[PDB]
Amino acid sequence: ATRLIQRLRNWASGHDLQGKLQLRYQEISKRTQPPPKLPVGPSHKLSNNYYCTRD
Amino acid sequence: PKKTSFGSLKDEDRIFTNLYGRHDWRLKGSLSRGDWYKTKEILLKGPDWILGEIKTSGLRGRGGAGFPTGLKWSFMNKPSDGRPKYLVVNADEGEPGTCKDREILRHDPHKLLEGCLVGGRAMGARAAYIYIRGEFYNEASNLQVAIREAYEAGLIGKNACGSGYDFDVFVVRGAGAYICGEETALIESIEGKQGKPRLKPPFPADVGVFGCPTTVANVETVAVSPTICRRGGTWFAGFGRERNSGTKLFNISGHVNHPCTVEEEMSVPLKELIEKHAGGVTGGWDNLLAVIPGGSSTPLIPKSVCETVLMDFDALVQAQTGLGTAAVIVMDRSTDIVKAIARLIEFYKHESCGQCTPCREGVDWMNKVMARFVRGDARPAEIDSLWEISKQIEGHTICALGDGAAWPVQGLIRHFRPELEERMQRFAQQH
Ligand SMILES: Cc1cc2nc3c(=O)[nH]c(=O)nc-3n(C[C@H](O)[C@H](O)[C@H](O)COP(=O)(O)O)c2cc1C
Numbered sequence: 208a209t210r211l212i213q214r215l216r217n218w219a220s221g222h223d224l225q226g227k228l229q230l231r232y233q234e235i236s237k238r239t240q241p242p243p244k245l246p247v248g249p250s251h252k253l254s255n256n257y258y259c260t261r262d
Numbered sequence: 263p264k265k266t267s268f269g270s271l272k273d274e275d276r277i278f279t280n281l282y283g284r285h286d287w288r289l290k291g292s293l294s295r296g297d298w299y300k301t302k303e304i305l306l307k308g309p310d311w312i313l314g315e316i317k318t319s320g321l322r323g324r325g326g327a328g329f330p331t332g333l334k335w336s337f338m339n340k341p342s343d344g345r346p347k348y349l350v351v352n353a354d355e356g357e358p359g360t361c362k363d364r365e366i367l368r369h370d371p372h373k374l375l376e377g378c379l380v381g382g383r384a385m386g387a388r389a390a391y392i393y394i395r396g397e398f399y400n401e402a403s404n405l406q407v408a409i410r411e412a413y414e415a416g417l418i419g420k421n422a423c424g425s426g427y428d429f430d431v432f433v434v435r436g437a438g439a440y441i442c443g444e445e446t447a448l449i450e451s452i453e454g455k456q457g458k459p460r461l462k463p464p465f466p467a468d469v470g471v472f473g474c475p476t477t478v479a480n481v482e483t484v485a486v487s488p489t490i491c492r493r494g495g496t497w498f499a500g501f502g503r504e505r506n507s508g509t510k511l512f513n514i515s516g517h518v519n520h521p522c523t524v525e526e527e528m529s530v531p532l533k534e535l536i537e538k539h540a541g542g543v544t545g546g547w548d549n550l551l552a553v554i555p556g557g558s559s560t561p562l563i564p565k566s567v568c569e570t571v572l573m574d575f576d577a578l579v580q581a582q583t584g585l586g587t588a589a590v591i592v593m594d595r596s597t598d599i600v601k602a603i604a605r606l607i608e609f610y611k612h613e614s615c616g617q618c619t620p621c622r623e624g625v626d627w628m629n630k631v632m633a634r635f636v637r638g639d640a641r642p643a644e645i646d647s648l649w650e651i652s653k654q655i656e657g658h659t660i661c662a663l664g665d666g667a668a669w670p671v672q673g674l675i676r677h678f679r680p681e682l683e684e685r686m687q688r689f690a691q692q693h
């Protein structure tokens with residue numbers, strides 16, 4: 208990961224590689240995440256739900 | 263009468279003297295009233311003109327059904343088919359808001375007995391069966407005594423006060439069966455069958471107790487009937503509005519200075535008897551916001567529509583209210599209503615037996631829903647769902663107990679919805 212080697216590598220590259228990391232380092236994303244709660248659903252209203260229409 | 267003027271009623275217009283127990287409920291008192299008058303001569307061995315006298319009387323159901331009793335009784339001009347015919351009298355008096363049939367039996371059995379004789383003759387009835395509550399033991403004994411006095415005089419029994427038409431009454435009792443307040447449930451009570459009402463591909467008129475054809479009528483109608491057959495039934499037809507011909511007992515009750523029963527012209531304004539016979543509610547009439555017509559069954563009436571309504575049931579129907587035997591329970595504003603209606607629906611849940619599923623489950627459910635409402639825990643939308651339940655109860659239930667089970671809370675939704683939400687917000691604020 209030495210900088211001269213980075214220079215020579217990007218040199219041969221014709222492209223920055225540091226600008227688009229290829230190997231996936233620190234950033235990733237957290238595995239342990241707070242609960243989803245989920246959407247309530249459109250037809251869980253109690254006032255009306257006759258099958259005659261939703262069907 | 264024909265005019266907007268009402269609240270008028272002559273005492274001698276009343277068919278019912280000794281309504282309050284004065285002037286001897288004993289048969290001698292009936293004779294002082296000359297009650298047996300032409301009662302023997304009414305029996306001209308042919309219904310028709312008496313049955314037509316009642317058809318012309320304009321008289322309708324006093325069971326709260328409001329159904330034309332002349333036509334109802336017209337049904338048993340039919341040949342007896344070789345099965346003996348009977349008349350069953352509805353004396354359940356278990357219905358809330360209703361003390362009307364109580365004092366009359368306590369103080370005037372005799373006019374009713376003459377009604378059993380005349381109306382029993384009109385049916386061609388072999389007998390005159392009469393139900394009694396198990397709560398009504400002592401009263402059953404009073405009536406049994408007066409009926410014994412009718413036997414000793416020979417006014418009943420064989421031939422019955424002349425004319426030669428055989429006529430034996432048969433007193434009958436039940437036990438806790440409020441549902442026998444429904445007629446067919448009581449017809450079922452007679453066989454020793456449980457009082458869960460029949461579905462009717464055949465009407466009770468077609469098949470009665472023991473398979474032998476019968477008939478039924480509320481105490482008021484059948485008691486007024488002999489006087490319809492004597493005094494002109496057109497004279498009965500003169501009072502009130504035409505469809506609402508006659509008079510009706512008005513049981514003012516609940517929070518009021520002087521609650522009472524007052525038979526009166528059918529179409530008096532509802533506020534009038536409150537301002538008159540009832541003496542007005544405590545704190546004045548202005549406190550009133552909710553007072554219910556009908557026997558704690560029909561939908562509530564707000565004071566605004568209340569000022570306009572006449573006591574006759576058609577005015578109630580324009581107020582979206584049934585007859586309900588025209589029982590009247592006043593409810594003062596200071597008390598919560600939702601607890602009351604919940605208590606009422608609870609009264610239904612205790613008493614609906616539960617043959618057909620929709621009403622059993624419907625009340626068992628709607629009650630708990632009401633408990634959630636009164637506790638205030640409930641979400642505002644939930645009440646609308648209760649309305650849906652009501653819609654599935656009404657035309658589906660095999661009997662009308664569910665109808666009155668549904669209606670009062672329908673009214674509580676329809677008028678007191680903002681009140682409901684207002685109650686729920688307070689429970690919302692506790693956190
Ligand atoms: C004392 C009494 C209680 C009644 N209770 C009920 C009831 O709980 N449910 C019901 O559907 N009908 C009830 N009814 C009405 C009956 O279903 C029946 O139609 C009525 O008694 C006959 O009325 P009529 O005699 O005026 O024709 C009751 C009637 C009376 C007289």
Ligand code: SF4
Binds near residue numbers: 616617621659660662
């Ligand atoms: S409907 Fe419900 S209440 Fe009316 S009779 Fe059938 S079961 Fe009893």
